[PDB]
Design a protein around this ligand. Sequence first.
Ligand SMILES: CC1=C(c2ccc(O)cc2)[C@H](c2ccc(OCCN3CC[C@@H](C)C3)cc2)Oc2cc(O)ccc21
Ligand SMILES: CC1=C(c2ccc(O)cc2)[C@H](c2ccc(OCCN3CC[C@@H](C)C3)cc2)Oc2cc(O)ccc21
Lengths: 234, 231
Amino acid sequence: SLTADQMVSALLDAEPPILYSEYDPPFSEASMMGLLTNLADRELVHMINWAKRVPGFVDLTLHDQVHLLESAWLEILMIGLVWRSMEHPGKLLFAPNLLLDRNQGKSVEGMVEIFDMLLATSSRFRMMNLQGEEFVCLKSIILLNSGVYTFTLKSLEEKDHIHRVLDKITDTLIHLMAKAGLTLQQQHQRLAQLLLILSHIRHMSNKGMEHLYSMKSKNVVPSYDLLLEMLDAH
Amino acid sequence: LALSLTADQMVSALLDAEPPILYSEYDPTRPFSMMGLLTNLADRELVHMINWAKRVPGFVDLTLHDQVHLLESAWLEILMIGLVWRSMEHPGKLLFAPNLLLDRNQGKSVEGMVEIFDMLLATSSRFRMMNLQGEEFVCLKSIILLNSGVYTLEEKDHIHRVLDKITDTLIHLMAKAGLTLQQQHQRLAQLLLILSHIRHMSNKGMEHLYSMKSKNVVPSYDLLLEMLDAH
Ligand SMILES: CC1=C(c2ccc(O)cc2)[C@H](c2ccc(OCCN3CC[C@@H](C)C3)cc2)Oc2cc(O)ccc21
Ligand SMILES: CC1=C(c2ccc(O)cc2)[C@H](c2ccc(OCCN3CC[C@@H](C)C3)cc2)Oc2cc(O)ccc21
């Protein structure tokens, strides 16, 4: 029932904070993955808070909320990272005090390939002059769309709802571009350009998941119970 | 020169470029390797895919090097969307060939296969529910070809001009179908979000194909280049 303007405002007010890496006056290659894992894990907690504020998300069953976050969490971490890296050519701003380049990526086997994809996405944002309002729409779309093709009377109802919210976010993107002064043709073209970036983000998440698993740590994905517990508040 | 086409000319060009539907190679008189049949079919389809790619307006204006790179990135996605398209009118089944219609139970005969079968079936069901039109389908397939490899100035600018042309064409089709402006952009977005699922399926499919430890998975640069038949 939200208007396009109300949708934008809701999403902007929902934005999580930018977190820091630990301070101690040197950085070492050996400690890099530990610092990244620590940031990712802290970002996840804020991500769950954020998701619950995306219009229509808490209308879903807790089960389906968990499934959507299971599907989307790394994509959401990535698009967040690319967004805060956009103004820093050649670098990934994991935190304001953890700004990393390609060569630092090389220290971890298999990492530079994923760094390069992320850097390429940052460059594409930059060449498109992606706006914050557009970014928060894209991030919401990822949340709602990434797990929807892999979820029953209840579920049919859930899927219809998700599609209706996704349509509203399309309307919102178009509203933003119209107010930005784009022609109808430029509006459709840019809508398309933005949504095609989501294919690349999905690609990066799958490649990244492969990479994280290859590292042989104790776990990679947030468990159902963990997501549930964070989501399943009293 | 390829960009000077109208939306109608673009649609007609893409429809005329469509590849044929191939048959599985086996004696239908003899007792019923599944992956063997599928691999044989995929490998034969790939050849027709390269010939289709050469007819997508704007594609051959790229260097041969870049044509090959795009095919390297897109080929499995393109195989998949074509499979889903011809499977649309066959709920619960994948029409790999007219003589090779498989259901998900048959897909369980190969380890790790049923998970990918289920994703493909879900996509075909989504297509059916949206009543995807052939004219929309050929636009989508062309977008996969141009978009899948674009994250690896003039060449990329050309690629984006062609992609913008296809967006224009899709909107034109929907406008002709009688959709309101709001319905047009909503449907455009719905179709493009399905492409992220097709990318997902290609990623999971590649993982699955590699896990089989067969002779090879991806077509080599030289194979694709030879199929392009350079002049
Ligand atoms: C994109 C990215 C990282 C990444 C992702 C894939 C890859 O192959 C290499 C690094 C790494 C990264 C490191 C570890 C990651 O997962 C660790 C496992 N936890 C995730 C959920 C929790 C239950 C366990 C996920 C990403 O660092 C980031 C930190 C951020 O705050 C935001 C994004 C990243
Ligand atoms: C989607 C699909 C198949 C598939 C893909 C991924 C997967 O995990 C399981 C089956 C299998 C499939 C089986 C083998 C495939 O690659 C084999 C390797 N060749 C591809 C190019 C050639 C150089 C080597 C690719 C797809 O069958 C299909 C046949 C078609 O005509 C169209 C689509 C498919």
